[model samples]
Target: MGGSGVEGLSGKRCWLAVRNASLCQFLETSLQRSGIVVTTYEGQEPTPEDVLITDEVVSKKWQGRAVVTFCRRHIGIPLEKAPGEWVHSVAAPHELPALLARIYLIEMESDDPANALPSTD
Candidate 1:
């Protein structure tokens, strides 16, 4: 919960395209602690950055943009039309790896291959 354990997530800029204000608040504070700069994107303009954290409904508009759909949908089920590489929910205990894992895997701006993430990829 302290946001210190999360790696490869800090220094990223995230746009909250969610319509629910209360849910946005939770994501903003929590993500900020992990060193991610959080911004509420109330406009229709797309963010210039890669990570856009949004809900399922608003997610449809930003096709081809890297987005993480944050909704009540279970982790096991992917959003039918949401565009992005990641999908998550508040119910998950660990949001760090779940939300940002694919980002780190694909966009490894970190050049250092620590092999810390246990995987067969």
Candidate 2:
């Protein structure tokens, strides 16, 4: 898994997404072996980034959680008709890749990938 701003995830209980059930199970077992409690949120869509987790050992766990909750409650967009929210909850322990992807998509601002490289020709 890539580096997460949140660190307590190693052995803490977390609610994962259903689409990532297999991933969640793997995470649960791995994290459990590592001494962390893991939980799966089957049927429940991924949590928005603004949800707050009560764990204290994680990196700014509370602050990160709060940001997720706040964004969900305030800045979530609609999917079709109903208001859609950002995926904040970690669907699985390894889901950091997804999170990173999301971050890359949403938070990563680039002028243009085409222009990313300097004149190599």
Candidate 3:
């Protein structure tokens, strides 16, 4: 785990819509160091291909797109049901980029990392 990190997601685009200004910039820099391209938007939308990193309120707007949500709450509903994806704002600086990369890597697959195996028959 010491060489390079997350090459599988190099150059992928991210749409950021966080409510906190400093947190948004912090995440953008962190993710870029991992080779993700980050874009922040206001009143705009993400294409199906761009991954979304957003807040609880904004998550509602991007239904059906790839999303990662950082909940501001210290305790709240489980992320499995609310956001399509989750990382707490507290740990997101370290975890979110890798998580995003892993998601795309899984999607770019023939293997069943998810184990549904719908088409293997």
Candidate 4:
């Protein structure tokens, strides 16, 4: 589940990858008003008290292409532990937007989509 809060910016494929089932329905209804596609995991069942999985992606590259990056690096954590541990562990829950903004910038900057290019010659 990964497509929850990014709608207006996600363009044609705006999605919310939610980790909870009920939350999925809730998000579907909530974000639908804003025009977003919500998809939840197979066994996820979230409560209103659960942490909302916001829009965020990790860096696909690391250290001049020498190091192997992981999701921990994206959220500045060592492991992808329990719920809310990804973001809320470090910052306030309401500060998700700012946290995601910083992560987005770093991840996007470190991304090297050009490396996935096929041979042109």
Best candidate according to TM-score:
3
Question: How are the candidates ranked when ordered by TM-score, highest leading?
Answer: 3, 1, 2, 4
Question: Total clashing residue pairs per candidate?
Answer: 0, 15, 0, 7
Better of 3 and 4 by lDDT: 3
Candidate 3 at 97: error in angstroms? 2.4
Off by over 4 Å in 3: 1-10, 74-78, 87-92, 106-121
Q: For candidate 3, lDDT tens digit of each residue in 1-121?
A: 5787655534667888877687778768866765667777566765777777775455244544567777766244336555455545544454555566566674422432343556876
Worst lDDT run of 10 residues, candidate 1, spans 106-115
Ten-residue segment with the worst summed lDDT in candidate 4? 61-70
Using TM-score as the measure, name the better of candidate 1 and candidate 2: 1
User: Per-residue lDDT for 1-121 in model 1, tens only?
Assistant: 5556645544776676767676667657765666667776665566545566666455244433576766676444355364455666555434533455456353422332434766897
Model 3, global lDDT:
0.62
Model 3, clash count?
A: 0
| Model 2 TM-score, all chains together | 0.29
lDDT of each: 0.57, 0.34, 0.62, 0.34
Query: Model 4, range 1-121, lDDT digits (tens) per residue?
Result: 6676745555212233433345345535643454434443233454332223432333221111011111222554324453333333312222333333333333323321333657898
